[PDB]
């Protein structure tokens, strides 16, 4: 009932990569997707995480884990991540929450150095 | 008829603390609920019994919005056979809980600078609270065999306790708002309805 | 759907405490949440206070009273201060959305 994401912060040079991790902990309930929003920098919007070369979006169902990895850092990436996990409809459970019933991680801090 | 008023429960300009948690009747309304599922404002927007993204094509007999200020920590407390100190103690939702619970990081109204410390919360009861149901009293909780007469000491605790909120803290302990949409469904006519 | 605040005005010195006093009173709710406004001397707004530190509030609920307690007295504590009661709970009969302010306390605090 809880999305612990990792790393709360992430401090990397341009070039390398790195990797965000959110997991559903003591969950019994089926979940349906999960989706990785972007707040730049300085903004207030957040941006929804699309196809992308350097973007790569893992899911272990089983494991209710889901990973977002970036390579080839640049500085247009610095920001904050969160990820989105929306539950499914597990039948015939009075405790668990409906289909569509979603929650955001705690977020990640990262900074790309140039 | 005429939109619900959500707006006057989750933009009031002051929030309760959960062991003093509000209650608003919506009634004789149309309700709009895609406007509060389909935002990036809501931290977490969990129903039970019923699926968000059919909230507009229901009706119901009769609609409470309870609202409170907890911390981040405690969020997944606010859910049906949860148990800890809040569901316990301070705001308790039935194991047959049909409604929505919409939670959101409220750091930048309810933290001040050096500590907010005017939330409450209920750390001592001598039984678990029913569903729905709130406390009020500030009784001394008798807290071991001696007994107490209104008095604060030892074995004699004040019930409540206060959150520490500050902007620095990590977000376990930062304020969270919390509305609760219940749902009642009987054989009568429904007086709140979707579009 | 009214709190009695009382004093109305008293004066201390630096140093010494003081206590103001308020109980809510014509209703059928308890007193469930509350709040004190103060407004400095030569001031035109009221900021709300925050308690735990300086500020010690009590509450007793059999009573619908609540107290507000003020120590180590600086010249800077000049001013009005009032209570708060409110609350917005609505059940089967009893409903109560009130949220009520006191007659106020003026005090002076003298120089060293
Ligand atoms: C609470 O207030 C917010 C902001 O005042 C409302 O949402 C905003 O609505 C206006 C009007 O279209 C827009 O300019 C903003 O973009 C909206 N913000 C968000 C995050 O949606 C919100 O509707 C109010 N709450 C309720 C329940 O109505």
């Known amino acids: ?114 | 008829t005429n939109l619900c008023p959500f707006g006057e429960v989750f933009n009031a300009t002051r929030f309760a603390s959960v062991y003093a948690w509000n209650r608003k009747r919506i009634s004789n309304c149309v309700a709009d609920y895609s406007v509060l599922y389909n935002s990036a404002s809501f931290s977490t927007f969990k129903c039970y019994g019923v699926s968000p993204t059919k909230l507009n094509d229901l009706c119901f007999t009769n609609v409470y919005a309870d609202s409170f200020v907890i911390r981040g920590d405690e969020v997944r407390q606010i859910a049906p056979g949860q148990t800890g100190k809040i569901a316990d103690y301070n705001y308790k939702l039935p194991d047959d809980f049909t409604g929505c619970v919409i939670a959101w990081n409220s750091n930048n109204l309810d933290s001040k600078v050096g500590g907010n410390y005017n939330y409450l919360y209920r750390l001592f009861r001598k039984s678990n609270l029913k569903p729905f149901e709130r406390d009020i009293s500030t009784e001394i909780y008798q807290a071991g065999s001696t007994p107490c007469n209104g008095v604060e000491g030892f074995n004699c605790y004040f019930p409540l306790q206060s959150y520490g909120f500050q902007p620095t803290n990590g977000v376990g302990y930062q304020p969270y708002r919390v509305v609760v949409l219940s749902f009642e469904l009987l054989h009568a006519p429904a007086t709140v309805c979707g579009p």
Not at chain 1, 22 to 46: F, I, M, P, Q
Not at chain 1, 58 to 78: A, H, M, W
């Open chain 1, 1 to 114: 009932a809880r999305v612990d994401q990792t790393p709360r912060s992430v401090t990397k040079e341009t070039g390398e990569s790195l990797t965000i991790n959110c997991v559903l902990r003591d969950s019994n309930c089926a979940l349906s997707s999960t989706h990785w929003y972007r707040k730049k920098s300085g903004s207030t919007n957040e941006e929804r995480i699309l196809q992308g070369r350097r973007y790569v979006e893992t899911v272990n169902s089983g494991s209710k884990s889901f990973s977002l990895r970036i390579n080839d850092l640049r500085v247009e990436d610095s920001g904050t991540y969160r990820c989105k996990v929306y539950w499914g409809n597990s039948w015939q459970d009075k405790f668990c929450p409906g289909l569509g019933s979603y929650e955001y991680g705690d977020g990640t801090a990262v900074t790309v150095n140039g």
